[PDB]
Nucleic acid binder design. Structure first.
Ligand SMILES: Cc1cn([C@H]2C[C@H](O)[C@@H](COP(=O)(O)OP(=O)(O)OP(=O)(O)O)O2)c(=O)[nH]c1=O
Ligand SMILES: [Mg+2]
Length: 428
DNA sequence: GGAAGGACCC
DNA sequence: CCAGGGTCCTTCC
């Protein structure tokens, strides 16, 4: 019921939030304006000469469409909520969510029927579901359950690659090979007369999920596909405790990618969705048809991206676990406009940043402060030394200054902060 | 390589 | 009266 989309829009109307949200949107239509206008200044010649480019490239892309790997994307269901429910029977049959009055990280599925969703403000969620119990996050409790599950996964692909605590990719192609020759008792599990799983990628995933539930009590969903991109889209097709596969042939990819909302693809945000919708693009088939216009309107990197999606292409090799490019700490709070205090709230952030930094014994050389007006407007000043910071005082050194400069930049005006934060980056 | 501003993911 | 952790992509010296 859109009584939801009303209670929300209603409880947002005058907020300084909707305020900046409007300014945000006005700036997107401008980016779009600068596009349609940019478009109009294109001639059939340029355009056709382009169709030639893209069509060739695509022709190559197409010759190297790898369909040998059986990638699997696994996604825990309502992770934080689910976990908090498991640790506390009290919440058993009640609707919950994990967050604060100002922000929910998720809502179990019962709460979802009421319109409550992740990233929705708490006070609003309480508007749609007064009976909503809101549990504070407990990440360590999550990393835990996440390690517990990563254990079950190592079995099918010791080199899996975790995207976030509740998601992961798996190249079960090798497992499937050895599994074709596995005695039924090597795929028989006892429930806690029981069950035995087949040899299909369909079945191994069916097993992987089974194990995960049996072990942590939480259900998960999975997508089975020829490559990364398709898999993550599939893991949501039946999302609550289900799975969906896309067979290893090109038509299968095609039949799925056809009519598939461009926005369901990972990387296409609410913003580029609106820009492509401007050009008349909603699905992947529409997106493909426009492979010409796109090469003239977007970065080589973007339309390159756009082309793979339109053709159902994507990673097929799970790269090694990269490295940490940065580490930050930031807090929101009831307005703080007093300078003495802001220098204090900062000392804290720096001190915290310093300790989470010691846990990984990391040392970077670039510190960025981050400030957010009472109007959500956001500044962000960097500063890179050449000695390699580490300690709390060291960081708070660059930071303190970085901050001073922005206070002064307001000469007699005090910075009306709602948010402040610190990020150290540039490690070895 | 930096410094600013953003889009997107969870 | 709208979070917080991270990564990657332009845009200017
Ligand atoms: C989206 C989103 C997720 N998360 C957290 C909440 C989730 O427990 C966790 C996983 O992301 P999601 O997978 O998108 O959330 P979910 O798994 O709980 O729900 P679903 O069953 O639809 O997959 O990360 C955030 O903290 N902030 C966010 O903005
Ligand atoms: Mg999930």
């Amino acid at each position: 019921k859109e009584k939801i989309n009303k209670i929300i829009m209603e409880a947002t109307k005058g907020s300084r939030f909707y305020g900046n949200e409007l300014k945000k949107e006005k700036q997107v239509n401008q980016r779009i304006e600068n596009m349609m206008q940019q478009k109009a200044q294109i001639t059939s010649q340029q355009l056709r000469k382009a169709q030639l480019q893209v069509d060739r490239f695509a022709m190559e892309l197409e010759q190297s469409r790898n369909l040998s790997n059986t990638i699997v994307h696994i996604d825990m269901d309502a992770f934080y909520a689910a976990v908090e429910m498991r640790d506390n029977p009290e919440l058993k049959d009640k609707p919950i969510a994990v967050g604060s009055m100002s922000m929910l990280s998720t809502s179990n599925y019962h709460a979802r029927r009421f319109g409550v969703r992740a990233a929705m403000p708490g006070f609003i969620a309480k508007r749609l579901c007064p009976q909503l119990i809101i549990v504070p996050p407990n990440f360590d409790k999550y990393r835990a359950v996440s390690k517990e599950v990563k254990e079950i996964l190592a079995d099918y692909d010791p080199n899996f690659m975790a995207m976030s605590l509740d998601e992961a990719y798996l190249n079960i192609t090798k497992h499937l090979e050895e599994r074709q020759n596995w005695p039924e008792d090597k795929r028989r599990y006892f429930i806690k007369n029981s069950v035995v799983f087949g040899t299909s990628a369909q079945e191994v995933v069916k097993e992987i999920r089974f194990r995960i539930e049996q072990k942590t009590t939480l259900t998960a969903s999975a997508g089975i596909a020829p490559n990364t991109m398709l898999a993550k889209v599939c893991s949501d097709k039946n999302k609550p405790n289900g799975q969906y596969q896309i067979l290893p042939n090109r038509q299968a990819v095609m039949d799925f990618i056809k009519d598939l909302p461009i926005r369901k693809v990972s990387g296409i945000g609410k913003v580029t969705e609106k820009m492509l919708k401007a050009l008349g693009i909603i699905t992947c088939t529409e997106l493909y048809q426009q492979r010409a216009l796109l090469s003239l309107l977007f970065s080589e990197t973007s339309w390159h991206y756009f082309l793979h999606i339109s053709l159902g292409l994507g990673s097929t090799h799970l790269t090694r676990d990269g490295e940490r490019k940065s580490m930050s700490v930031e807090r929101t709070f009831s307005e703080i406009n007093k300078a003495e205090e802001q220098y204090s709230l900062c000392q804290e952030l720096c001190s915290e940043l310093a300790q989470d930094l010691q846990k990984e014994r990391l040392k970077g050389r670039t510190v960025t402060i981050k400030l957010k007006n009472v109007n959500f407007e956001v500044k962000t000043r960097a500063s890179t030394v050449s000695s390699v910071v580490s300690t709390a005082e060291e960081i708070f050194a660059i930071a303190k200054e970085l901050l001073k400069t922005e206070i002064d930049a307001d000469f007699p005006h005090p910075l009306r902060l709602r948010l402040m934060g610190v990020r150290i980056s540039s490690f070895p």
